[PDB]
Design a protein around this ligand. Structure first.
Ligand SMILES: [Ca+2]
Length: 223
């Protein structure tokens, strides 16, 4: 996260870390057995790490559970990143408590102007690299569809929205991919892509989760 603040241990209880030997992407816990992340975070051998704050220290609230199957969206396009969303089923159900909790799926799409919380363990610098060990947080507004498309001409689909600041300085970044954008207690976005991080007129682009709610619900119901 560039230009954010330290969340505080376990203040974002639905945040997961996807680990294949090292942290490579974020994700959100949507019920005791399913995680939603970005389709571009797909790989085999994923271990889901719940209840994390410092991903390099075992502090006592962690649950490490292996994934039993991953399901990338049927229309994921890796060249355009349209439909960048994937579901991971855990091999065992997570034990839910105040520090490990699920986030609700939205009933409505959130409008431009809504302030949201974005979190993850991605890079914290706009040029150069420094990866945090503890979870970082950023409050950012959803931007209008016209600001988003004027920033990324020919690249924004209806399954995408922008959030952040056109002045730059604050944004998610590499490593935050797959992670949550929560607005009014509902998961509305998944960290997906952007041009660099925290650049002027280059806000983050996020997968619009409210378009995928029937696919999530039907897939969970049969798998
Ligand atoms: Ca830890």
């Amino acid at each position: 996260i560039v230009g954010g603040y330290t969340c505080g241990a376990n203040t974002v209880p639905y945040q997961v870390s996807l680990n294949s030997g090292y942290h490579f992407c974020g994700g959100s816990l949507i019920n005791s057995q399913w995680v939603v992340s970005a389709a571009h975070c797909y790989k085999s051998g994923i271990q889901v790490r719940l209840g994390e704050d410092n991903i390099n220290v075992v502090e006592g609230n962690e649950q490490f559970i292996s994934a039993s199957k991953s399901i990338v969206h049927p229309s994921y396009n890796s060249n355009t990143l349209n439909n960048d969303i994937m579901l991971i089923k855990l091999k065992s159900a997570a034990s839910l408590n105040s520090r490990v909790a699920s986030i609700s799926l939205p009933t409505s799409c959130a409008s431009a102007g809504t302030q949201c919380l974005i979190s993850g363990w991605g890079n914290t610098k706009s040029s150069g690299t420094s990866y945090p060990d503890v979870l970082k947080c950023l409050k950012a507004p959803i931007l209008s569809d016209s600001s988003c498309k004027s920033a990324y001409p020919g690249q924004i689909t209806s399954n995408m929205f922008c959030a952040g600041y056109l002045e730059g300085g604050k944004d998610s970044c590499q490593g935050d991919s797959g992670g949550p954008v929560v607005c009014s207690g509902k998961l509305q976005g998944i960290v997906s892509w952007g041009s660099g991080c925290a650049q002027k007129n280059k806000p983050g682009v996020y997968t619009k989760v409210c378009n995928y709610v029937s696919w999530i619900k039907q897939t969970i119901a049969s798998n």
